Amino acid sequence: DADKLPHTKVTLVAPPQVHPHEQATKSGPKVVEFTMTIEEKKMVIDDKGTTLQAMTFNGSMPGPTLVVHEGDYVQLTLVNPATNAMPHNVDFHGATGALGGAKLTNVNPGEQATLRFKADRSGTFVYHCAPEGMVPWHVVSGMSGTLMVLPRDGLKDPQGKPLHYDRAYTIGEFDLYIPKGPDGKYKDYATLAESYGDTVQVMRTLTPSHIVFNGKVGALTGANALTAKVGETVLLIHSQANRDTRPHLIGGHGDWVWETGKFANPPQRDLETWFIRGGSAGAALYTFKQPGVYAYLNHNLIEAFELGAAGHIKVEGKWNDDLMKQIKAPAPIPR
Amino acid sequence: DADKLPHTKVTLVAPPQVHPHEQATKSGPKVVEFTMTIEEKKMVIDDKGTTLQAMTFNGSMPGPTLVVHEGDYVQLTLVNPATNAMPHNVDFHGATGALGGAKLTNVNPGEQATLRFKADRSGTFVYHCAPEGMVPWHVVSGMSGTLMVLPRDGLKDPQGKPLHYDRAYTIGEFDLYIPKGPDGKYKDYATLAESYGDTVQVMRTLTPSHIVFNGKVGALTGANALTAKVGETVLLIHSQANRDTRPHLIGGHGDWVWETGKFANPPQRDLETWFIRGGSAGAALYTFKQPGVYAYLNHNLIEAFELGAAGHIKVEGKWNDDLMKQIKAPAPIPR
């Protein structure tokens, strides 16, 4: 019984970070309490000033990653401030019943609700808003994130041997559908409601105008590049609530990958590129062996480079000439 | 030898039902006899009266699911009535040789043929029409269904333990390519032949006008919703003969899933969303734990909600507060 268990309260952190947590734990099941606040806002999504009338959990795309252990109970308070225009809710793919909790969390501006569910299956799971009659619009405008349910004894390889990560990052990939006017320029809308009709028309073409990691072209680059060191194992959580993607780490691999994102299944090893089904979250481990700047991208390279689905990982440490060596630098072809 | 074995005759049933069959069986191999009759017809495919010049096995999209056991022989009589305009045939992905049987089943209007093949591999397999020079048109117009070949000892989990379903449903998902006129309204064609040229032009854009379960937007909703009860394990067969899809059960999971649809492989567990490759059939088991109305959909939510790829499952039984509980109903945010 959940009402017998101790409660803990978790403070969420903004992507691409994930809140502190244990992997393998000696602790027993708890009710883990979270709160998130919905924020509708206009966001700038590229280098040319294009805007999105966005909708977010906690002010970010994706929403923050919530981490519990299998057998824990997730207790979320969902707050929809009066400053918002739309009703919202939440559907946890990690949850059982009531359309993932959406039926029990319908909150108008000025309202909040509290949902509890048993996190009885291990894995990374999408959560998203799903208000009746406007589900795809709320999802594509930014309302999704990941629930990670770790097995109580941590991650395991196909032989049941232990696996771990030293650092975790969370990447949400967002296919955006920004309308254009007769002049061919992207439209800028005074309000969220006004963007609706034009946006549905673009959606129906199934062609995104932009595909971005974490809310903007280049969000995970420059000062905002992800970071690691040679010898460190990184977990890369990748969520795509609406559309397929194919993550790839340039100069790296997926050492151990759950592409369908469910930890009770054995992971695959040595992947060059993996596949995240639209409407799911997956997870890859990589241990860095070479220093330098990596790209982490959707390996539809048009989607990555033209449309925005690419980030960077800056890695410190010592170059290994055994793994790779420039034998002859670029030089004139011998006569 | 097939000519030594007893024969049985099976009466097919219309989707979403599947004809009565055993899973694990004590019976030995048989020649299992089926008949299907091709029907070309104009069908209404949405709520606004849009029509498709369709082509079907047995009058339905998808055609009926045929069920045999591994080692059985499938013996199909394929009938193309004189009331039809086009030649047709059948390609069983479950079969070996002669382009899946297409080369041996070329039937003009007024003709029939009988094909036998050994069902020597377990799984759900697409069958479809494939007449030379018009293969994609016949497939996208409705001519596909599933052959399920059950292992003789029934379904098994990754550890070789037994799995079963108490109820089976079959869902065919159809990417449709309906042309539009200068006025932007969908075209209605007097005949099947007349729809061809315009339809090929739409196909070549790779953008479906509609994506529907079982022949129509909302085919598996209302009076036609699928049904189950808490405690019942349902098999959901999903076929897509031309285009990728990503099935998801809202408020549920894929407890055991063969997404590539081949039962000799271990299934994955706890899936939120799985992946059916265009040109294949997959299979998922789910045991219901909560009552209420579920949605079963393609989790490209635009494809589901805007284009038609979504159905409903109405489930009876008792709510389980341990799995999910509304702690605080939606209420004013405390001052």
Place this chain on the structure above:
Amino acid sequence: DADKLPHTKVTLVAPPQVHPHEQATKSGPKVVEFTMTIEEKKMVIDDKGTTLQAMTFNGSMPGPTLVVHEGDYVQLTLVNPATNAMPHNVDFHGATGALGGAKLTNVNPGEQATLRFKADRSGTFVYHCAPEGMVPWHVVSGMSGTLMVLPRDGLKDPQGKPLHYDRAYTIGEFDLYIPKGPDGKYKDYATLAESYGDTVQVMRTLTPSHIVFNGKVGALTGANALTAKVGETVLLIHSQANRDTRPHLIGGHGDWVWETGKFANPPQRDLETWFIRGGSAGAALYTFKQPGVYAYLNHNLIEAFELGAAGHIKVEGKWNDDLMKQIKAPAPIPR
């Protein structure tokens, strides 16, 4: 240490063939030396004279398949002749560091470079050109191929039993983005540089004009069909550096398939259709049991039949009536 090991030199062969190699080997690790020369050229890609301003490794699409064993070192000399207009490089997905080697192989026309890397992971891996700021253009114009890294003890089934192929073919699938003029005819460009702007515009629509195996509609058909015999096991390597595809052998199966292309993972059996993620190479084994002409295709049938993603395999041997038999040839429906 690589500088302690013996060296061997390999002569590459044009697709769809793959250079002679051992599978399971008694040999120890070597530095395996390869050379490839970049050729930019205008190529005719369909039956109606449409041209592509193409870019190739060794004059072919795909580039040749390089085969080594796990633990070997790949040492590639990459030559960019002065007759070319563009800078190029190479990114091996099979390699670790320096963006797959791209950072160490930047060659202007008239230059060459030599890269060494440790092939420490088994599988089929994409290699492609990736010059900074023009990565997708170089890839979609033809600059990709496969590195196959065989395990030292050859291929294994899920139970660790030996698997092998008697013949290997390599298929690269290329989503092409050829621009059209106001008249709706495909544009023909005097130079590679001139094609750039228009091509980027087409790319951004995410809709290929053509999708071809090995450089042209019908490249693997007629005199150029692949060949086998009943009783022979064929390895089919399928690379797609930019876009998802779903290979299928009509009248056949994937007997053993690594769809994500990494041999340390167990293969799946009995596949009807498998999935190659954009930015990866996969591998399927099939042992022929029936003679005749097979099609090997992308089972988005529009992509196959309308856009060009289909080839043929002509197979010799004896028909097996146990696997498939025409019981009744097409005949008038009995009155």
